[PDB]
Design a protein around this ligand. Structure first.
Ligand SMILES: [Zn+2]
Ligand SMILES: [Zn+2]
Ligand SMILES: [Zn+2]
Lengths: 8, 383, 65, 146, 168, 122, 237
């Protein structure tokens, strides 16, 4: 949802 | 004053949409699929194997919805009553047999509400209110034993479509080109074809072998082309690689040519296959004949099953090999098994056609043994 | 099904303004906003009561038995 | 890294290349097999200098690999290293020669020392995959960080 | 703040320049691969670092603004529900969607949706959602955010199962 | 670049044979007894790093392909500004992101690769 | 299988799937999705050879590489040089109604292939057709205000129908497979040749290639999601 290295 | 040729605006969209829903409503996928069954598919099934060793089936008629009464006339049946009275909103099936020395009732077909065959399809608004059926019912379902039943669309992969796939680091096969050919009508004989590329990058002589049905061994593709009448190397590679300049692809095949050297003619080719599909006591001709029939009916059936179409399959087999190589050469990515364009959604229509076929094939078996069990059908469908 | 007797939130009697409201639209060709204020529905709780109601009884009455 | 060398971004690079596995496949541009009959003079123009320069049994078939200088000096590799590695791979069962580190092209030439063209394609393969030029078995990527 | 929204918009507009230049660079074959990485791997790497820096800085700009009256901020200052990431997606940029650790893949041949052209690695094409929830998402931003959304639902199902068996 | 030949008579693949006495390369058939001399001495070539495939797809009707991006660079030949461009059609991970343009006026293929290392792009 | 694929756009709702085990395996068709019912290919396969499709039995590749190969329902029926005019015709025929709208025809120019689909089970949706047959300006949607007036004219009278639009080449049906070969405009407005700061930010219309235009983007949604207010301001899950 958020971005790469985070949630989708 | 409002130039009819003036560009359209974003707001003008809903008009085009309302028009869409005004014509199809919300469950046209259901209705349309089922109507296609009743109207066309139903008949087409009565003509497949519509003959026995004579007795042949002719035309089909689908009654409006009626009820089988115990101690009573056959009544007309309206959905509202079918629900309440735990019935099955179905209509009778009548065929047209031709008994030749060498109508007729045949089962009940449950009917989808609001389909051409249903009583509510032509009903006006007040006709509905009198019939105790909400004018808001969209109806893409069936009424079986009193309960409303829906056939959920079953999604599956499409047929007759080449697809190459890489393979797990362990297996001896580095790539596979697959097709699951089947016939549109008649009987859907789905005999899978697999063109495998043996050996991983860096293995010695990566060979290509196909997998024919009923044959207990993968056959080098060159032997198959020759079995199909295409004998010389040059001619075979020409069906695979369509560019005389693509030395890399041509090079990937060198080991294929070598792998099929021994077999230098159509008969020896056919015998080669016939043997991997026949016991050790069978005479040459029978073997060769076995391989001919296989390549004719079990091999790439979606193309043809008739006779003089060997060149048509050689080019298609070559096509598959082309696409397989095009992937092994890192020039195309292996096919995406999740692309929706290669899926298909089965609905009431298609679904109802598998049962009906199979069932009609049982009713057709019994006849080979007015001596007609109508229940074989009305039960299977209802079941 | 039918015009609620009163406004859920405050109690205002509203079960007596449905026919009026209906006429205020057809025969007087007014708009729901103006129509509602002229029926005395000033606070939005009572407004929504009518502006949002759905007279489904009219459809039930169309059934024979 | 060892105690007194944790800041030398350069010793870190050396150790990286000494651990990271490296086969000939990772440094080769292309491989070819030529019919080059006269072990002395060559059919290939560019390699005339390399054969003369090597004077201060063999089959007529030639295996010729073209190595890339980038991946080369990158993984800190010498023509002499790569070559001496291949040679000490195929005992006396293979004639090996290679251009020098100054020549503009990195090229290796090998001859089997009759079903030749075949043995060669197998040998060509063994080289690109089974020969370790430098590094440890299994260790593939090797990244530095601070 | 009216001004903050201008600052936030430009902050992203700046990231699309940084990403646009790394493209021209890479399209010229000037990008240098980081040892043990493909050009394309390090290319993506940078675009993702760029975009995230944007998302982040866009979020702080929004965080800083909110007064003490701001109820969302009041909840955060106390501990009860809400974090930076939440305020940031509502007010400033929503962020970059992603499935399996990468930007939205070319489902169609060489493109994310049939509305783009082939070989479009721009942020708009590959899943960066510029708008906040407040501003609303565009159809493309919406689908991409649903793709990312589904990934979470899927392994919330998995993660759920796999843990009830491990604990046992 | 091992462009190989087939038999004159039977159209079968030819194989590399050595004339030991005169030390030269021949290609014989293994079906009949045909045999010819060789064009080049190159018998086999394996490109670990390849370029072929990059340009695949440059067809005459390539400009009518609506999905393709268009630019207005200048082709080194006719200087026209009607271009259609795509990335490398090879499907390797170790590929660059260089662009290949196609002059829609004279169908000339040019690149954005500032390290242009080839002349034909084939 | 349970992941939301790109090719699901417009055909299956991106939001309505059940949580849990059936997640992503149980889908819902978007408001305007339909499913092919099936058509006979004979007519098409006949027209094809009447129009220059060389039979596979007489196809020699080294003698015509540039040839495009044609497939119908998976069958490679033949080859055809200059397929461009055949494709123009095929589309015109379908836009008349001489070829069933339901039929999917795709031309992959770079791949030298032309594929036709007549089988049942293919999911498709309707899009506005955009061609430049209009002199006055540039490329425009073939549906004009005059058409919409007739549509609404037939509404108010409760005869210009959805089928009329199909018959007059104004709208087309499109399946995921064909969707591959086209470029779609999101809003008919970005076919056009100091900004409200409250609006959401959007991208440009650098497209002089548009072949179609979405009827309305909110149609990617299914029935359930079509009831959520402002679903585009909500978190995905
Ligand atoms: Zn009130
Ligand atoms: Zn011969
Ligand atoms: Zn030019």
């Amino acid at each position: 949802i958020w971005g790469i290295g985070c949630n989708p | 004053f409002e130039d009819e040729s003036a560009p359209i605006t974003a707001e003008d969209s809903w008009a085009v949409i309302s028009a869409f829903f005004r014509e199809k409503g919300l469950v046209s996928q259901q209705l349309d699929s089922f109507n296609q069954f009743v109207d066309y598919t139903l008949q087409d099934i009565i003509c497949e194997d519509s003959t026995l060793i004579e007795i042949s089936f002719g035309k089909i008629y689908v009654t409006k919805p009626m009820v089988n009464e115990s101690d009573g006339v056959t009544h007309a049946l309206y959905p509202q009553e079918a629900r309440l009275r735990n019935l099955t909103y179905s209509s009778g099936l009548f065929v047209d047999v031709k008994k030749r020395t060498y109508k007729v009732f045949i089962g009940r077909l449950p009917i989808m509400l609001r389909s051409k065959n249903c009583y509510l399809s032509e009903a006006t608004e007040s006709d509905l209110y009198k019939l105790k059926e909400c004018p808001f019912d969209m109806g893409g379902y069936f009424i079986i034993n009193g309960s409303e039943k829906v056939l959920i669309a079953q999604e599956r992969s499409a047929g007759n479509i080449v697809q190459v796939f890489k393979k797990a680091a362990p297996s001896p096969i580095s790539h596979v080109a697959e097709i699951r050919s089947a016939l549109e009508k008649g009987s859907r004989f789905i005999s899978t074809l697999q063109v495998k590329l043996y050996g991983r990058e860096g293995s010695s002589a990566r060979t290509i072998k196909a997998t024919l049905p009923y044959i207990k061994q993968d056959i080098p593709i060159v032997i198959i082309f020759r079995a199909l009448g295409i004998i010389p190397d040059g001619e075979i590679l020409e069906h695979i690689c369509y560019d005389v300049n693509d030395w890399q692809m041509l090079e990937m095949l060198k080991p294929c040519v070598e792998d099929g050297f021994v077999i230098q003619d159509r008969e020896t080719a056919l015998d080669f296959i016939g043997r991997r599909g026949t016991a050790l006591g069978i005479k040459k001709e029978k073997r060769i004949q076995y391989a001919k029939d296989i390549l004719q009916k079990e091999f790439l059936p979606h193309i043809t099953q008739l006779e003089g179409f060997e060149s048509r399959k050689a080019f298609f087999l070559g096509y598959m090999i082309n696409r397989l190589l095009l992937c092994a050469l890192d020039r195309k990515d292996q096919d995406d098994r999740d692309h929706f364009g290669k899926k298909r959604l089965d609905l009431a229509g298609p679904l109802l056609a598998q049962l009906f076929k199979t069932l009609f094939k049982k009713l057709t078996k019994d006849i080979f043994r007015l001596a007609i069990n109508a229940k074989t059908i009305t039960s299977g469908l209802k079941y | 099904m039918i015009v609620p007797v009163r406004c859920f939130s405050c109690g205002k009697v509203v079960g007596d303004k449905w026919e009026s409201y209906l006429n205020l639209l057809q025969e007087d060709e007014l708009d729901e906003g103006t129509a509602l204020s002229r029926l005395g529905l000033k606070r939005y709780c009572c407004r929504r009561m009518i502006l949002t109601h759905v007279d489904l009884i009219e459809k039930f009455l169309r059934y024979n038995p | 890294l060892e105690p007194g060398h944790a800041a030398d971004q350069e010793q870190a690079k050396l150790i990286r290349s000494a651990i990271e596995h490296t086969t000939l496949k990772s440094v080769t541009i292309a491989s070819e097999i030529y019919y080059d009959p006269d072990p002395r003079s060559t059919v290939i123009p560019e390699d005339e200098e390399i054969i003369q320069l090597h004077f201060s049994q063999q089959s007529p078939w030639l295996l010729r690999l073209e190595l890339d200088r980038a991946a080369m000096n990158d993984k800190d590799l010498t023509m002499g290293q790569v070559g001496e590695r291949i040679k000490q791979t195929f005992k006396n069962d293979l004639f090996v020669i290679w251009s020098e580190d100054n020549d503009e092209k990195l090229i290796i030439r090998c001859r089997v020392v009759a079903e030749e063209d075949h043995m060669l394609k197998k040998i060509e393969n063994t080289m690109l995959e089974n020969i370790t030029l430098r590094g440890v078995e299994n260790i593939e990527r090797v990244v530095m960080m601070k | 703040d009216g001004p903050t929204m201008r600052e936030i918009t430009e902050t992203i507009a700046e990231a699309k320049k940084k990403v646009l230049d790394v493209t021209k660079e890479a399209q010229a074959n000037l990008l240098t691969a980081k040892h043990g990485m493909t050009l394309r791997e390090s290319f993506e790497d940078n675009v993702v670092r760029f975009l995230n820096e944007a998302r982040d800085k866009a979020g702080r700009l929004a965080e800083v603004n909110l007064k003490d009256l701001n109820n969302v901020k009041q909840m955060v200052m106390a501990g009860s529900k809400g974090s930076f990431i939440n305020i940031a997606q509502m007010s400033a940029c929503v962020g970059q969607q992603s499935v399996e650790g990468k930007r939205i893949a070319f489902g169609f041949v060489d493109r994310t949706l049939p509305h783009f052209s082939k070989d479009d690695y721009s942020p708009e094409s590959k899943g960066f959602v510029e708008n906040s929830y407040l501003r609303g998402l565009t159809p493309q931003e919406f689908f991409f955010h649903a793709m990312g959304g589904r990934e979470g639902l899927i392994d919330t199902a998995v993660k759920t199962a796999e843990t009830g068996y491990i604990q046992r | 670049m091992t462009t190989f030949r087939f038999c004159r008579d039977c159209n079968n693949m030819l194989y590399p044979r050595e004339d030991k006495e005169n030390n030269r390369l021949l290609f014989e058939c293994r079906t009949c007894s045909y045999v010819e001399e060789a064009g080049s001495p190159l018998v086999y070539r394996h490109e670990l790093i390849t370029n072929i495939g990059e340009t695949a797809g440059v067809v005459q009707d390539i400009g009518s392909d609506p999905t393709l991006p268009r630019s207005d660079r200048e082709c080194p030949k006719c200087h026209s500004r009607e271009n259609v461009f795509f990335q490398s059609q090879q499907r390797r991970k170790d590929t660059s992101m260089v662009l290949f343009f196609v002059c829609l006026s004279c169908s000339h293929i040019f690149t954005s690769d500032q390290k242009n290392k080839r002349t034909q792009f084939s | 299988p349970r992941q939301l694929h790109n090719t699901h756009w417009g055909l299956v709702c991106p939001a309505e799937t059940p949580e849990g085990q059936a997640c992503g395996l149980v889908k819902n068709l978007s408001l305007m999705s339909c499913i092919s019912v099936g058509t006979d290919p004979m007519p098409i396969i006949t027209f094809l050879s009447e129009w220059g499709m060389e039979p596979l039995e007489d196809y020699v590749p080294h003698q015509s590489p540039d040839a495009t190969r044609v497939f119908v329902n998976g069958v490679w029926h033949g080859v055809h040089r200059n397929p461009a005019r055949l494709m123009e015709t095929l589309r015109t025929l379908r836009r008349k109604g001489d070829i069933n709208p339901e039929v999917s025809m795709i031309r992959d120019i770079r791949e030298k292939e032309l594929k036709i689909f007549t089988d049942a089970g293919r999911v498709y949706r309707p899009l506005f057709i955009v061609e430049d047959d209009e002199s006055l300006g540039h490329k425009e949607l073939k549906v004009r205000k005059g058409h919409i007036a007739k549509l609404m004219a037939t509404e108010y009278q409760d005869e210009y129908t959805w089928s009329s639009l199909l018959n007059e080449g104004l709208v087309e049906y499109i399946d995921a497979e064909e969707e591959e070969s086209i470029l779609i405009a999101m809003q008919p407005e970005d076919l056009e040749p100091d900004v409200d700061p409250a609006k959401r930010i959007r991208v440009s219309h650098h497209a002089t290639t548009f072949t179609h235009c979405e009827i309305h983007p909110s149609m990617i949604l299914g029935v359930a999601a079509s009831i959520i207010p402002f679903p585009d301001h909500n978190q995905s899950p």
